[PDB]
Amino acid sequence: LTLWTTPAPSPNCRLNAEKDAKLTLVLTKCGSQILATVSVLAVKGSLAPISGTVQSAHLIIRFDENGVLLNNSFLDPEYWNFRAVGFMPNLSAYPKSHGKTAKSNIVSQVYLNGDKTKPVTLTITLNGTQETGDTTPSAYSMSFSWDWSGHNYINEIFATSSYTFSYIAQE
Amino acid sequence: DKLTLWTTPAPSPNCRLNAEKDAKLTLVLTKCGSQILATVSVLAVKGSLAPISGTVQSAHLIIRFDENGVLLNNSFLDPEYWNFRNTEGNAVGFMPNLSAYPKSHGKTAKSNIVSQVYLNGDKTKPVTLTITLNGTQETTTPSAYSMSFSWDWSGHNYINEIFATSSYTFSYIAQE
Amino acid sequence: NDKLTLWTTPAPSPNCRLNAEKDAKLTLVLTKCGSQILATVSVLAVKGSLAPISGTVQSAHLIIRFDENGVLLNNSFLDPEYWNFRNGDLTEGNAVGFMPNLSAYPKSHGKTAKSNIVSQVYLNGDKTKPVTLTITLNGTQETGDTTPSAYSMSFSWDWSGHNYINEIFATSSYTFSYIAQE
Amino acid sequence: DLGKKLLEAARAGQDDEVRILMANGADANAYDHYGRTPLHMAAAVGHLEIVEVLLRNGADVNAVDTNGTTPLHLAASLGHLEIVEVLLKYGADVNAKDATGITPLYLAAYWGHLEIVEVLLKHGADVNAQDKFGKTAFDISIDIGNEDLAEILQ
Amino acid sequence: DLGKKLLEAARAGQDDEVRILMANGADANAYDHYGRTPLHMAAAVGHLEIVEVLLRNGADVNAVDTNGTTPLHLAASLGHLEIVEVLLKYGADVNAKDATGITPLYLAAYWGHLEIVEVLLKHGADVNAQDKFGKTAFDISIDIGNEDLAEILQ
Amino acid sequence: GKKLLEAARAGQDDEVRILMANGADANAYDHYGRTPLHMAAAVGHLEIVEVLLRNGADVNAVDTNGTTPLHLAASLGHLEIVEVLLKYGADVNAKDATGITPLYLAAYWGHLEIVEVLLKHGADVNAQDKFGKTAFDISIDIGNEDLAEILQ
């Protein structure tokens, strides 16, 4: 089964402002592992075109104890459905609030405009968030942090190549 | 099953990078519901990439498919090493999805998967591999789908080496 | 469905030997997707000269060898109590369906570029501390008095030229796939 | 559509393709939906001849994209000295602020393009300009450790 | 525990955080379960002021982790000259040997830090100390092809 | 035979005369036409290049693309090897299957001292390739100040 944003979503996530980018993310459950493919394209704001000294962006998707998005704040729940704990990142392998645990990160280079001379690092962190006080907790999370420190891409549109990864599923 | 479409695990020379049958492309597509899981490598067997000669710093292979996901003839990939494992199923289930990767949108970022692979499996000899999905442009027989592989090692001097890469895994959204 | 996964569990105890007995936790999960295995792997040293990285050590490796039924050769290098089918005993699944295909990745004296999958992983999941991981499938060919194996998977980490002394050798997670033998 | 072609040819650094298109009546002020104009494209990729053909055909020298970024921000940030000079000759605005208050001098300082920094200061660049966080080009020289830069800033 | 927060602040180079923590009673000699102390963290990341604060507060300049690595091994290996000088000023053992016989001189030589090799030699660094293969800092220079170092060590 | 090919690549200066002493053939070739002297010229093992030449290795051996050891040494920046090849009578003007010469490769990859040596040894500055480019078209091409200068 597949949990996804659809293959071509409308603006459906916030990197810096409401609906300022399209995240295409597909999670396919292959038994104990989730096979995933991801890319992002900024549609407005300070990453379209990249402006000033901006050299990073990020998005944290949080889910509740049933694997359901916590709310429409950051990824729009209208572009997020089956084609859910069976798609959540395994808490034994990627322990909640421990995104600094090396193994909870999958890190690789992706490329602006699909051009091999414009790398961008993508760090995906699984269950890396901790909520305290009054903050509603998430049970699970999946974070994408893009970073191109030291590269001057001003005037480019932040639009990445597509990238595949997998992770152990919670159930 | 009818869930694999491949060149076999060990093909004879089956593709043209510059001249007929000058390379062996190993390419396996396994359908995992809405995604295809793939693994690819290539090895040149003769011509200007075996050994790498002159200032050659790139190679490419474009595979084109018709509206039923069948390999076009006159394909630079030999249709004899391209078939379902044994059986015939539905090739459209293996094609890259045209909403995610629209036809002739090869320069759109999202239609490309780009990563480094390594000559001889050797970490000190990187080669970039750019895979482009549905990027083709015929204005030629029309293709409905395509999968391209572009190897590029600009700025690296690998003259005298044999062009033979490590294996690489990627996935993409299937058309149906 | 538990028979389609062969793994170390998601959080093993010390279960492999990089330089000394049980000196590292290898997390390795193989899931069988018909003709391909989809794998995810990472490693964390827990004692010895990679915890913290000491001296000029700039590499580590682990070779896992299997017999002709796809069963680990011995409790030498990876501990068989953290290697089994998910929720399974040895008779719950068939381990040859998880082995690297011999016709794609041969057992021979020769070297084969396509038997390697090579990519960078990162210490502490930190993009500024790369380490190369070379995975080699069936890359052993035992001679002399070495006990033979039918299949192998080896993991060679190398960070030549980077000085990571005082870091713990703990890597990010990495996905790859390969053609299955059956 | 002559605009799209002109945007693409300026971006690709096709000097002549640009001249041919101008010849055929392409609008030097076309813009894409992010507000980039051909002169942003040419300034960013560093094609001097293209910058000049456009300015001679009446390209708005201080056109802003949707974030307030001008061609002189681009050329100063990315280090294209001779483009920075030609832009200035045509009325480029040394004190243009983008949407968070960043100026061409702030970017040339941040990325270490010192000769560009000198050129901007001699054309009246305001050194006390702060971004929306209160940081100036002097704060940059301290944060990024550039001693030559801090020296030049007085 | 204040110890864990100190270990973390030293490693993240939080100069100020470390002072706050020492102000509040944090133990300068806390160690993690690999035997790393805040002084190991600070010598490795290169943070001089934290190294000084900890040493002013009684940090053990000769602490070893489970492999016998000292803060001086870390500063000499990673090339932090002023930290190497300060550790030596507080009584760091110049020829401390890790579990395989490696000294600060051998690591400074292997990674080509020539100024640190010269400071270590003036405090009595021993050119004869061999690694597990029988090789000295000198043999490693010969190997590596480093002629400047080979003359300093001979 | 193949042992030699492997020792020359691997840089095992020792093995090579071990193998030569036993009558291993200095002109062995693999199925791409590469000889031990191509392997040694490519990896830059001077000693090995000299032992092979003293044992009558063919200095002008071509692989299946017409590449000679002098192309490899010039292309990859091995100056002493370029000098010893020329001493043993390597064709300074050797053309590969597309017309490329050692001078063309030395220029392309910015090995200016080797460009100087090839010229002294009579490399034709005017040899062209595919596009009909020559070492000079390469200079103002790759935007190379000093190479434009040396091509005098």
Read off the CATH number of the domain in which B18 is found: 2.60.90.10
Residue that has been written with the tokens 């192998």 in this structure = C152
Q: Does D76 touch chain A (CB under 8 A)?
A: no
- Report CB contact under 8 Å: B167, C178: yes
- Please state, in angstroms and rounded to a whole number, the distance separating the CA atoms of residues A19 and E39: 46
- Where is chain E broken, named by the residue before each break, C–N > 2.5 Å? none
CA distance C14 to C46: 7
Distances (CA, A) of E123 to A75, E81, E89, E93: 60, 14, 10, 9
- Rg of chain D (C-alpha set): 16
Which residues share a beta bridge with B83?
B6
Dist. CA B113–CA B101, nearest whole Å = 11
* Three-class SS of A63-106: ECCCCCECCCCCECHHHCEECCHHHCECCCCCCCCCCCCHHHEE
Chain B residue numbers with beta carbons less than 8 Å from the beta carbon of F105 are: 54-55, 159
Q: Are D35 and D60 a contacting pair, CB within 8 Å?
A: no
H or E element in which residue E49 lies: helix E48-56
What's the CA gap between D46 and D60, in Å, rounded?
17
* Chain-chain contact of E40 with C51 (C-beta, under 8 angstroms): no
**Omega into C52 within 30° of 0, i.e. cis?**
yes
Q: Cβ A53–D78 below 8 Å, yes or no? A: no
Q: Which of F42, F64, F100 is facing B160, going by the closest CB pair?
A: F42
Number of folded domains in chain E?
A: 1
Q: Is-contact E12 E44, C-beta < 8 A?
A: no
Range of the domain at D14: 1-154
Whether residue A49 has a cis bond before it, omega within 30° of 0: yes
DSSP B93: G
Structure tokens at B17: 């990078």
**List of long-range contacts for F101-104, beta carbons under 8 Å, 24+ apart:** F101/F71, F101/F127, F102/F68, F102/F70, F102/F71, F102/F73, F102/F74, F102/F75, F103/F74, F103/F127, F103/F135, F104/F129, F104/F134, F104/F135, F104/F138
Cβ atoms of residues A79 and C100 within 8 Å: no
Residue B45's nearest CA partner among B16, B65, B72, B71 is B16
Method: X-ray
Q: Which pair of structure tokens corresponds to residue C165? A: 């002394």
Indicate the residue type of C16. Answer: C
**Based on the structure, what is the number of domains in chain C?**
1
Does the distance separating the beta carbons of B43 and C113 come in below 8 Å?
Answer: yes
Residue F94 and residue F82: Cα distance in Å, rounded?
Answer: 13
Rounded to whole angstroms, the Cα distance separating A24 from A10 reads 9
DSSP state, B37? E
Q: Which residue of E has its CA nearest to C53?
A: E67
Contacts C51 to E, Cβ<8 Å: 34, 66
Instruction: Inform me whether the C-beta atom of residue D143 falls under 8 Å from chain A C-beta atoms.
Output: no
Residue in B36, B92, C10 with CA at minimum distance from that of residue A26: B36
Q: Give the C-alpha separation, F59 to F81, whole Å.
A: 11
Q: What is the CATH number of the domain that holds F106?
A: 1.25.40.20
Residue F149 to residue F152: CA distance in whole angstroms? 6
Which residues of chain B does C177 touch, with a Cβ-Cβ cutoff of 8 Å?
37, 39, 169
Query: Residue E90, SS3?
Result: coil
Q: Distance of alpha carbon E65 from its chain centroid, rounded?
A: 11
CA–CA dist C159, C161 (Å, integer)? 6
CB contact under 8 A, A113 and B132: no
Taking an 8 Å cut-off on Cβ atoms, the answer to whether C55 and E131 are in contact is yes
Please judge whether A102 and C44 are an interchain contact, meaning their C-beta atoms are less than 8 angstroms apart.
yes
CA B97-A76-C126 angle, 5° bins: 80
Q: What is the DSSP string of D8-72?
A: HHHHHT-HHHHHHHHHTT--TT---TT---HHHHHHHHT-HHHHHHHHHTT--TT---TTS--HH
C-to-N gaps above 2.5 Å in chain C, after residues? none
- Residues of chain C in contact with residue B166, where contact means CB-CB under 8 angstroms, are 113-114, 116-118
- Would you call D113 an interface residue with chain A, using a CB distance cutoff of 8 Å? no
